């Protein structure tokens, strides 16, 4: 199960807002991509955008943990 | 040095672009804040914004590692 530890190299997908912000993160924690929907790229509401990015990171982290709870 | 392991609760600051995107992350990896400068909230260049967020996450991760290399 040092074999299981090398799910550090799994890519996990997180999202907030139903895909308004999507992120790709390695099991290691390394963030490899961020994809932002044009709807939330609005300079009159940066706050919402920021919250969705944090939310999508949280989603991914909780995914990593769910896939890790597999041995 | 299980005492040192509880630098999991340190807050570390990362940035890209000279502050265009700033992030706050716990030593644990948990992202707690993201702050985006209005200049890069431009729907004609989402790509740049995305790259800065990844860049700021990378910065923070490298900070966590630098502070961890302290015992």
Curated annotation (Swiss-Prot), chains A, B:
GO cellular component: bacterial nucleoid; cytosol; plasma membrane
Main location: cytoplasm
Keyword 4Fe-4S annotated: no
Protein location: Cytoplasm, Nucleoid
Record's keyword terms, sorted: Cytoplasm, DNA-binding
Known role: Binds to DNA and alters its conformation. May be involved in regulation of gene expression, nucleoid organization and DNA protection.
Subunit structure, interactors included: Homodimer.
Family from the record: Belongs to the YbaB/EbfC family.
UniProt protein name: Nucleoid-associated protein Rv3716c
Full protein segment contained here: 22 to 92 of 133
């Amino acid at each position: 199960l040092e074999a299981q530890q090398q799910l550090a190299n799994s890519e996990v997908h997180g999202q907030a807002g139903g895909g308004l912000v999507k992120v790709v993160v390695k099991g290691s924690g390394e963030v490899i991509g961020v994809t932002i929907d044009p709807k939330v790229v609005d300079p009159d509401d940066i706050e919402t955008l920021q919250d969705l990015i944090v939310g999508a990171m949280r989603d991914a982290s909780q995914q990593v943990t769910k896939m890790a709870q597999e041995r």
